[PDB]
Nucleic acid binder design. Structure first.
Length: 801
RNA sequence: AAAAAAAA
């Protein structure tokens, strides 16, 4: 129903000196008057609203405004430093004619805000916070071009991104609060837009078919679907009508040529009879806009693209790679650019801020974090062979697994053409796999019992059925995939839903180019696919909460992309099954699209508790939850619903059963970066902060429990720390204890020998959600649950890893 | 789809 308060400040670690991109802001403790402005029609854009409001202010001055400069957010609200003498009642004033109206609702004040920030007891007034945020943005909004919360200047785009896409630089601004002061958040950001060239070469570029004169066919008849799905949803800028601005979204496009295009006389004939103009390319198709009764047509040769449109659809791998390469940069360059932008902004010579009386600083804020110690890991075999991570990475050479799994029966399915793998590469592959496995842990034995070529994506089920029927005690199958065929999806579906056998996939390139690191990683995957154990945390160095049985949970919600068909959203929950947290299970299921609530939480938690009891013979006393992917400003309703669902699930299983519950939400999509103050303590070529640095003061909320943590070693660009925010606490933990527990849980990932960003439950929930998304891809609410349900023989293993 | 990080 509420949130806890901070039980002190942690005092374990080694001090560090950092810098954060927060600039202080001062307030004058006055009273500001709140007004409401509404203009019809309601479909007018924000730029036009601002223009008409400014015109009314400037040229209807003596009637209303006397020597006063208001601030307008953009949609409905305006503010003024002094009371407007128009009156307290709803007084309305007055294409080329617009109508406005005035109100007086909710006069706000700032002394209460200052008192709340100086003494952490009462919550911060969102009305005052929004007033300051609106007053701190007016000149930038008026001058620059606003794209969401970005302020990209109109000078300099460059960096073509491939097919009809570009990258625009800018910055992002916010007035997030802090302790004793308000602070301004500045950060460099980049986005993607559409280049504004004529549509003929736009299509030529997107199809890479510039040499089309050699093949003047009316249509390709193979990529027309993708061309239509690309062009659809964009606004045109035809200028043949005299800057008429036919801003009609192109819903439908025909494919017949202008020669065969008939409507009550073709486009060429109508254009001739109207303007006496000849069309150079008649064999091209035509664009259709408006209603069918209107039948307004547009030939492709006299059309353009409007500048200033965002992209929502998916991208391509090479486009993503080149975007990352273009916008990578590094920490010193980022710091220099941030400082240059802040010094160039010159917020102290602005008429509006001068009128209100706000003052802003010039230098970055100083913070003092600390570095937590790293744990140690226990291996098995002939000798213990403990491992000590160094700079977030350790190695496995010379050590054996904790619990090996001998392999006796296995098969191999080839696929791919015989040219790239015929007889020689496979022998070396098998021999090196056997040697590496014998060196490390599981001793693969014998010769493969099956090795055949099965080209064709429709010949998977009969082959797997024959293998299962013929070879008793099958234990593993190896698959080789040529490219990006749907064979991967078909194999996953067949081996998880229908039959229930373990499978492993690998590329041809890594088979014709062997490598010890690749082979070791593949063995790491295979060992836990079969049901073994890789390593466990050393029991001596561990938290004090493990003295009694506990269970760790996690959750995630995945939403459909763009605005395509109403495919269902997917939610998932995972939980541990061992005293040392090394094994997990998943209970994915679907729900109504576009909703940020898990509805079946009670059933999921009841099932997980039943499985935990069946596997451990005990009953959990504490529960730890790690929710991921919560939009800001929608937390209290989510907390209420889930906290009630968890308690109901606990109640229904057994009467008078009530364990403790801890609720934690993680956030990785924000705009806070921490840089290193000294030049003698930069780790790596990119000069990032070391791994395991936490900050808890001077940039965090006054009377709530939260912190920052960076638990991975950056390798490219600049790092991005994660923000944790507890909501409900019932086990009365402590700050250092909880931070150490999270840091230790970051080390349990099983697919690599490196520490990672967010905990293993969060990764596992995301992975099972993505696997379910692959499961749903086939080529009806009743059949969706059956499609997502996985086989009983594989419900118990870690098939997602 | 050997694996982590970096941009939306």
């Amino acid at each position: 129903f509420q949130a806890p308060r901070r039980p002190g400040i942690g005092t374990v670690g080694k001090p560090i000196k950092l810098l954060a991109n927060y600039f202080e802001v001062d307030i004058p403790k006055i009273d500001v008057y709140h007004y409401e402005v509404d203009i019809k029609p309601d479909k007018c854009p924000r730029r036009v609203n601002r223009e008409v409001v400014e015109y009314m202010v400037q040229h209807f001055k003596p009637q209303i405004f006397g020597d006063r400069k208001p601030v307008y957010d953009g949609k409905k609200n305006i503010y003024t430093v002094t009371a407007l003498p128009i009156g307290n009642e709803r007084v309305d004033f007055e294409d080329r004619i617009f109508k406005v109206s005035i109100k007086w609702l909710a006069i706000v004040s700032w002394r209460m805000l200052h008192e709340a920030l100086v003494s952490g007891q009462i919550p911060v007034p969102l009305e005052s916070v929004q007033a300051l945020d609106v007053a701190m943005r007016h000149l930038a909004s008026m001058r620059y071009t606003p794209v969401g919360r970005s302020f990209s200047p109109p000078e300099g785009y460059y960096h073509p991104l491939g097919g009809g896409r570009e990258v625009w630089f800018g910055f992002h601004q916010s007035v997030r609060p802090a302790m004793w002061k308000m602070m301004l958040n500045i950060d460099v950001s980049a986005t993607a837009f559409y280049k504004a060239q004529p549509v003929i070469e736009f299509m030529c570029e997107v199809l890479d078919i510039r040499n089309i004169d050699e093949q003047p066919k009316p249509l390709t008849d193979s990529q027309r679907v993708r061309f239509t799905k690309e062009i659809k949803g964009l606004k045109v800028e035809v200028t043949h009508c005299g800057q008429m601005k036919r801003k009609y979204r192109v819903c439908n496009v025909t494919r017949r040529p202008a020669s065969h295009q008939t409507f009550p006389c073709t486009v060429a004939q109508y254009f001739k009879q109207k303007y006496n103009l000849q069309l150079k390319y008649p064999h091209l198709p035509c664009l259709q806009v408006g209603q069918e009764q209107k039948h307004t047509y547009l030939p492709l040769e006299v059309c353009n693209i409007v500048a200033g449109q965002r992209c929502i659809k998916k991208l391509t791998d090479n486009q993503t790679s080149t975007m990352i390469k273009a916008t990578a940069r590094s920490a010193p360059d980022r710091q220099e650019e941030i400082s240059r932008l802040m010094k160039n902004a010159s917020y102290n010579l602005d008429p509006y801020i001068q009128e209100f009386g706000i003052k802003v600083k010039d230098d970055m804020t100083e913070v003092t974090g600390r570095v937590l110690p790293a744990p140690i890991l226990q291996y098995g075999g002939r000798n213990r062979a403990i491992a000590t991570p160094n700079q977030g990475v350790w190695d496995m050479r010379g050590k054996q697994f904790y619990n090996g799994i001998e392999i006796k029966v296995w098969a191999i399915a080839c696929f791919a053409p015989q040219k790239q793998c015929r007889e020689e590469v496979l022998k070396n592959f098998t021999d090196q796999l056997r040697k590496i496995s014998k060196d490390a842990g599981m001793p693969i034995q014998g010769q493969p019992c099956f090795c055949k070529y099965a080209q064709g994506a429709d010949s998977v089920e009969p082959m797997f059925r024959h293998l299962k029927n013929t070879y008793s005690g099958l234990q593993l199958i190896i698959v080789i995939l040529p490219g990006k065929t749907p064979v991967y999806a078909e194999v996953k579906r067949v081996g998880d839903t229908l039959l229930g056998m373990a499978t492993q996939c690998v590329q041809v390139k890594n088979v014709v180019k062997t490598s010890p690191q690749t082979l070791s990683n593949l063995c790491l995957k295979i060992n836990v696919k079969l049901g073994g154990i890789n390593n466990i945390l050393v029991p001596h160095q561990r938290s004090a909460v493990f003295q009694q049985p506990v269970i760790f949970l996690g959750a995630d919600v995945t939403h459909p992309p763009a605005g395509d068909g109403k495919k269902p959203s997917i939610t998932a929950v995972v939980g541990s099954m061992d005293a040392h947290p090394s094994r997990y299970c998943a209970t994915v299921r679907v729900q109504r699209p576009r909703q940020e609530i898990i509805e079946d939480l009670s059933y999921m938690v009841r099932e997980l508790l039943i499985q935990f009891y069946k596997s451990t013979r005990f009953k959990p006393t504490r529960i730890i939850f790690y929710r991921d992917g919560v939009p800001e400003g929608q937390l209290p309703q989510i907390l209420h619903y889930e906290l009630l669902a968890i308690r109901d699930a606990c109640i229904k299983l057994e009467k008078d059963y009530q364990p403790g519950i801890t609720y934690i939400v993680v956030q990785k999509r924000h705009h806070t970066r921490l840089f290193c103050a000294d030049k003698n303590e930069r780790i790596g070529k990119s000069g990032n902060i070391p791994a395991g640095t936490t900050v808890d003061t001077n940039i965090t909320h006054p009377f709530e429990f939260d912190f920052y943590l960076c638990s991975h070693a950056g390798i490219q660009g600049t790092s991005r720390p994660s923000h944790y925010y507890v909501l409900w606490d019932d086990n009365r933990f402590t700050a250092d204890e909880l931070q150490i527990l999270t840091y230790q849980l970051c080390h349990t990932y099983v697919r690599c020998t490196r520490s990672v960003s967010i905990p293993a439950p969060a990764y596992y929930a995301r992975l099972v959600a993505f696997r379910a998304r692959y499961h749903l891809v086939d080529k009806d609410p009743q059949a969706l649950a059956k499609a997502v349900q996985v086989h009983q023989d594989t419900l118990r293993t870690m098939y997602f890893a």
